[PDB]
């Protein structure tokens, strides 16, 4: 929150805080209409800007905010994890029921697409990748990898049953390990950042 003087240069009007700078901007106790953030404190400063008409005193005030994750957890991170679990539960069904696991996989993909659409519409239209975008991308990768792996398992049926059994037993336990390590590294790098 930068404020200064319009029409009065530094040699005419100067600003200053009336009390100690740490105690000048005072936020009330019940004065918080924030729903998504958390006000941590204030921070004042004073400087000079060099414009086309002269130098002007500018008083700066920074309010430090920290976003609360409780909404986005239930909105995106709980549906992504639950949808990934719903994709991974298909590996426990037998290889002889192919339409069942097929509609499992494809409707899990459908859930991921509508989830990504509903979760992308909250954040403004930025032109880079955020952490939620990376999470949705990796979860989509896991779900799609589960479905393509199932397609591979089904394709290997009626020609090589031992290979399909081996790769379905290996992918019945390799998927939770990779998903858990990804969760650990992601939350560790984005909570300690």
């Amino acid at each position, epitope marked *: 929150l930068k404020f200064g003087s319009y029409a009065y240069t530094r040699a005419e009007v100067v600003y200053e805080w009336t009390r100690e700078p740490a*105690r000048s901007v005072v936020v009330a106790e019940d004065g918080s209409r924030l729903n998504q953030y958390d006000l941590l404190g204030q921070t004042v400063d004073s400087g000079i800007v060099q414009s086309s008409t002269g130098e002007y005193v500018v008083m700066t005030t920074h309010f430090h905010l920290k976003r609360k994750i409780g909404y986005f957890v239930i909105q995106t991170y709980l549906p992504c994890i639950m949808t990934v679990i719903l994709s991974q539960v298909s590996f426990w069904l037998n290889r002889e029921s192919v339409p069942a696991r097929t509609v499992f996989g494809v409707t899990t993909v459908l859930t991921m697409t509508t989830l990504s659409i509903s979760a992308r519409n909250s954040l403004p239209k930025v032109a880079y990748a955020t952490a939620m975008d990376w999470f949705i991308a990796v979860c989509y990768a896991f779900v799609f990898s589960a479905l393509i792996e199932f397609a591979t398992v089904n394709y290997f049926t009626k020609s090589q049953p031992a290979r399909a059994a081996k790769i379905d037993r290996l992918s019945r336990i390799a998927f939770p390990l990779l998903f858990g390590i990804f969760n650990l590294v992601y939350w560790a790098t984005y909570l300690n950042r």
Partner: antibody
Amino acid sequence: VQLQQSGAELVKPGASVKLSCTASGFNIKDTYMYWVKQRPEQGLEWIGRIDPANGDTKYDPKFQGKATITTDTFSNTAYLQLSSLTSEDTAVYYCARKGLRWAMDYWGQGTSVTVST
Amino acid sequence: NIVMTQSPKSMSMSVGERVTLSCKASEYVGTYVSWYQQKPEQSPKLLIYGASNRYTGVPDRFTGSGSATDFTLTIGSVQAEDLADYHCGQSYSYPTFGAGTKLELK
């Protein structure tokens, strides 16, 4: 413009002292007035400040209750009273005023109190 | 209570050379760090008010450099009257000063 302090004091540990700082060249109701102490061959230490236009005073937590700062507007004077001073606060006491970017631009001349028997 | 740590505690230097003094704050002090000069048996004189602003009557060889926590005071062509103590003090909160730096001639 100028701050003038009183002379040195030679008091006994356990009594009270009153130092004065008279301002010439400005009205003390426009700025703050600071009291600083400096021990022999050491760094400065802020005692407290007073807002003469209001009367609000603030003190250092290690000086709350010991020192008390008052002001006299009619003669443009700032007073520092130490209540019960022991055998270690034998320092030089400076009187300062706040400046442009909240700095102490004008300082007094120093009052070197000495406690002994 | 914001503590200001000044370095070095004591130094020696010859005439006509650049010298740099440093002040480090524990907490955030925006640009409200001031540098005072105190000759022996005299009251301190304000040299630099705010971060990088010279006071009226200070030569053009003193200049300050500010940040959120790290502050420097650099002198250029140093003459023979800068044999004094230099204190840094913050004014973002209730003022606290640094320990001081004693410049000497050698």
